[PDB]
Amino acid sequence: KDYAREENGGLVVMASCSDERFPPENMLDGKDNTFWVTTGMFPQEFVLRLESCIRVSKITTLSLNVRKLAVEKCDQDKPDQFEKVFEVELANRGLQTEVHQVNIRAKYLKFILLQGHGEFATVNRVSVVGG
Amino acid sequence: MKDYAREENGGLVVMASCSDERFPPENMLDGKDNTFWVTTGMFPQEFVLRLESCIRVSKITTLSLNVRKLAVEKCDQDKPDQFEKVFEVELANLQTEVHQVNIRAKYLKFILLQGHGEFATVNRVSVVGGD
Amino acid sequence: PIDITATLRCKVAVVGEATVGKSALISMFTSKGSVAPVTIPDTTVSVELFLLDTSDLYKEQISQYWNGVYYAILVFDVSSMESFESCKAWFELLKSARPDRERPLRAVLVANKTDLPQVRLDMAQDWATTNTLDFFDVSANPPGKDADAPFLSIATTFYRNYEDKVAAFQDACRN
Amino acid sequence: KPIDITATLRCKVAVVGEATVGKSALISMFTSVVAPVTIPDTTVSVELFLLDTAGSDLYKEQISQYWNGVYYAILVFDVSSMESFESCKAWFELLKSARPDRERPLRAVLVANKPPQRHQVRLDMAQDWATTNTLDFFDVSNPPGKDADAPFLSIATTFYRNYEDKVAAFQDACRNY
Ligand SMILES: [Ca+2]
Ligand SMILES: [Ca+2]
Ligand SMILES: [Cl-]
Ligand SMILES: [Mg+2]
Incomplete structure (x- = not known):
């Protein structure tokens, strides 16, 4: 499955900025028309937590106005220590x-929007595949 | 018809806005492509060519390096006290x-209104026409 | 907090000579409550103005991913014409310095009063206007009352184009 | 020695730094807005066009049409005010940012001028910063009047040299074409 989704226990717990009109939850409802939006500066980040510590074969994001993005993993069950997975200029x-x-x-x-192409940016879908 | 800019047809620069004796205005009307006049700093910069007689001009033509915007102005009276615009051209790399x-x-009158660098050159000026 | 449903953040360069009392204008706007938060009147939106008095600006400026300054509060001292001049130069290369030339520099001009030993307000309002800048005169002698207006102004100008961009986004993604 | 000058070059130099660091004096010492110096061992004279921010030489320039940025600067601070040094550093960075043409290096010079603040200036370190940013550094102490010139002459010479650079590059390019 894709444990991003709210329904496979997917849950954002440590976003760095929010507007109740475009809450982190909008990233894991599987729709393409809803989103989470940043409220100002950069960088910005948020931390997705999956039901169990799983094997990830493929990670995938749907965004607007993101320029540099970084992703980090944590295999422990408290988000004590994160370790870089990748980094991508868009x-x-x-x-x-x-x-x-x-x-x-x-x-x-953890997903970090390190820099954007504008003043603000959005994340519409986050998908995490594996078992 | 002649090229009245050529120094050999009375062509003569009288009111250049900057000069280095190593690259004097005269270098624009010797008909060679390897000699030039160079600017000594800022912009804009201009110089005033005077032809033997007031003539009918049909082809004006310049050879330059590093010029970005250029303007040209005529004066049909026999003193350069009133000039009237002829054209204006943005150039390239x-x-x-x-x-x-x-x-x-x-x-x-030729005005170098802006350059692509700190300095610029004019190598040839050619003025064709008769009367 | 009020019932705040969104907190937006905004990097604001606060520029102008040392002796125009920038510290005072900020600290009083800051301290006034008891990073400068203001909630936009008639909304549940709070805006945190990140105020960069020019060692701070520099720290920011040489950090990686640093992305320019597009909000500014220009302060001068009625007592020093030359302090006004400096604001204008600043302003122009802040416009020049923008990474993204397609985002307008949004600024506000403020007239202050260094209580310590000349500018034409007159001309300043005019310049401000000609450059489409809100102009706020503090110098009159209300230290404390309306230090807020500039900050609130700038914060509101920021609020608004947030809402702009956010709607633009909803436009761009259905479905 | 002079007025046997065969070339006059011109150079827009922003002269920035706080009002109270004595830029005026520095510019006055130097001249008594155009500051000629002839480059030692040449028949070349350079006119430095000195744009004190305040003012309003620089802003006027800035909003004129065709205005083409500032790529030479003299940064002045007051040993008495660490904060005046700070200001120089910010200035410096966005002067680099503000350049229309990002492929032309900003050429600058840092000057220490002569109240004292609680956090004074370590000319050791100022010198260090300068150097780390590849800036000529000039301490305006010895008294007022002697070496106000060095910065200006420095900057004027830095300018001279890349003139000669460009000029040879040109002769290169049109022997071919
Ligand atoms: Ca969605
Ligand atoms: Ca030639
Ligand atoms: Cl202050
Ligand atoms: Mg000090």
Whole structure:
């Protein structure tokens, strides 16, 4: 499955900025038309927590206006210590998709928007595949 | 018809806005492509060519390096006290720039309004026409 | 807090000579409650203004991923014409310095009063206006009352284009 | 020696730093807005166009049409005010940011001028920062009047040299074309 989804226990717990109109939850409802939006500066981050610490084969994001993005794993069951997974510069316009096949155990996944193409940015979908 | 800019047809620069004796205005009307006049600093910069007689001009043509915006002005009276605009041209990244015109002029003022670098050169100035 | 449903953040360069009393204008706007938060009147939105008095600006500026300054509060001292001049130069290269030339520099001009030993307010309002800048005169002698207006102004200008961009986003993604 | 000058070059130099660091004096010492110096061992004279921010030389320039940025600067601070040094560093960074043409290095010079603050200036370290940013550094102490010139002459010479650079590059480019 995809443990991103609220329904496979997917849950954001440590977002760095929020507007109740576009809450982190909007990243894991599987819809493409809802999103989470940043409220100002950079960087910004948020921490997704999956039901169990699982093997991740592929990670994938749907975003608007993101330029540099970084992702970090934590296989322990308290988000004590994170370890870098990757880092990606993106490009222009107004939706971005990204795919990353990876092979890691993780329980928490941190996503950092390190810089944007504008003043604000959005994340519409986050998908985490593996078992 | 002649090239009245050529020094051998009375062509003569009288009111250049900057000079280095190593690259004097005269270098614009010797008909060679390897000699030039160079600017000594800021912008804009200008110089005033005077032809033997007030003639009918049909082809004006310049050979330059590093020029970005250029303007040209005519004066049909026999003192350069009143000039009237002829054209204006944005250029690009050895630049030759040819323009067809029909005007009477005795003096022709060339202004380098902006360059692509700190300095710029004019290697050839050619003024074709008769009368 | 009030019932705050969104907190937005905004990097604001606070520029102008040392002797125009920037410290005072900020600290009083800051201290006044008891990073400068203001909630936008008639909303549940709070805006945190990140106030960069020019060693702070520099720290920011040489950090990685640093992304320019697009909000500014320009302060001068009615007592020193030359302090006004400096604001204008600042202003122009802040416009020049923007990474993204397609985002307007949003600024506010403030007239202050260093209580210590000349500018034409007159002309300043005019310049401000000509450059489409809200102009706020503090110098009159209300130390404490309306230090807030500039900050609130700038914070509101920021609020608004947030809402702009956010709607633009909803536009761009259905479905 | 001079007025046997065969070339006059011109150079816009922003002269920035707080009002109370004595830029005026520095510019006055130097001249008594155009500051000629002839480059030692040449027949070349350089006119430095000195744009004190305040003012309002610089802003006027800045909003003129065709205005083309500032790529030469003289940063002045007051040993008495660490905060005046700070200001120089910010200035410096966005002067680098503000350049229309990012492929032309900002060429600058740092000057220490002569109340004392609680946090004084370590000219050791100022010198260090300067050096780390590849800036000529000039301490305006010895008294007022002697070496006000060195910074200006420094900057003017830095300018001279890349003129000569560019000028040879040109002769290169049109022997070919
Ligand atoms: Ca969604
Ligand atoms: Ca030639
Ligand atoms: Cl202050
Ligand atoms: Mg000190």
